[PDB]
Amino acid sequence: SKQKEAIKVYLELLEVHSRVLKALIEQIKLFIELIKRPDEDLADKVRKSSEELKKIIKEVEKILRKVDDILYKVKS
Amino acid sequence: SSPVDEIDKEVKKLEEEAKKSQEEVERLKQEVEKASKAGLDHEGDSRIFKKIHDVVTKQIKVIIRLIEVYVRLVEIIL
Amino acid sequence: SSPEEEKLKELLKELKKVLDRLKKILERNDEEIKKSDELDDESLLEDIVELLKEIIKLWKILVELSDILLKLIS
């Protein structure tokens, strides 16, 4: 059923948002130390965490496309 | 006292809320899996989705508070 | 006020705009689901679509905000 389909989407979002929390907390801590003291190794792992967030964006765009596929078939 | 140290304090508090959120998510995933393996009514699927919706909403609100703290961090150095 | 600082303040005001409308979406979705009993499948996915769109815009601003902050802090 389509209500079970919206359940699968939300479960996917929980797993995604957990990695958003983990990535966002790391970036804030890294900036706290960068503001107190600049360090290139710290700046590098900020760029690494930013790239991880970019891949998460792509995962959320894939979730959205799959939901739009269902909505398009429902409204058809 | 110090503004950056106040933000450091607030992030540690929000980090603990993230840990508690993840713990609640794991309890939900176990209940959903138990509900998936059982023949549920359309009302049973309703209460399950409402349960999942509340956990999703709580988790996003933790993210928003993190971002609002993040914003305060940016405004300090500006 | 400098060019890069103005770019950050513009993105920061856009971030506040996105957060505000995101909280309105969470409230509307929570309000619509609290009607209990049977839930429509179309409106449920449409509410999800609107949530995902703002969530995607949110992360995109955070990614760009992180880049500008690294330029400022050097």
Residue numbers in the entry:
A (entry chain C): 0 to 75
B (entry chain B): -1 to 76
C (entry chain A): -1 to 72
Sentences from the paper on this structure:
We designed helical heterotrimers with specificity conferred by buried hydrogen bond networks and large aromatic residues to enhance shape complementary packing. Crystal structures of a helical bundle heterotrimer and extended versions, with helical repeat proteins fused to individual subunits, showed all three chains assembling in the designed orientation. We succeeded in determining three high-resolution structures for DHT03: the original base construct, a one-arm version (1arm_A21/B/C) and an elongated two-arm version (2arm_A21/B21/C long). We show that computational design can create cooperative ABC heterotrimers that can assemble as free-standing helical units or as hubs in larger designed assemblies.
The first crystal structure was determined to 2.35 Å resolution. The design model (shown in darker colors) has an overall 2 Å Cα root mean square deviation (RMSD) agreement to the crystal structure (shown in lighter colors) with the largest deviations upon individual chain superposition in chain C. Many of the hydrogen bonds in the design model are not present in the crystal structure, but the overall placement of these residues is relatively close in space to the design model and the ABC heterotrimer still assembles with buried polar groups in the core (water molecules were not detected in Fo–Fc maps, but we cannot entirely rule them out as the overall completeness of the dataset was ~75%). The placement of these residues also appears to be effective in specifying orientation as the chain C orientation in the design model matches that of the crystal structure. There are two possible explanations for the deviations in the hydrogen bonding between the crystal structure and design model. The first is that optimization of nonpolar packing in the actual structure distorts the protein slightly so that many of the designed hydrogen bonds do not form. In support of this, the crystal structure has lower Rosetta-computed energy than the design model due to improvements in sidechain rotamer preferences, Lennard–Jones/van der Waals interactions and solvation energies. The second possibility is that, in solution or neighboring low-energy states, small backbone adjustments allow for more or all of the designed hydrogen bonds to form (Rosetta may not accurately capture the energetic cost of buried unsatisfied hydrogen bonds). On the one hand, the crystal structure of DHT03 shows that many of the designed hydrogen bond network residues are not making hydrogen bonds due to small local distortions in the structure. Instead, they appear to be buried without making any hydrogen bonds, which is expected to be extremely destabilizing.
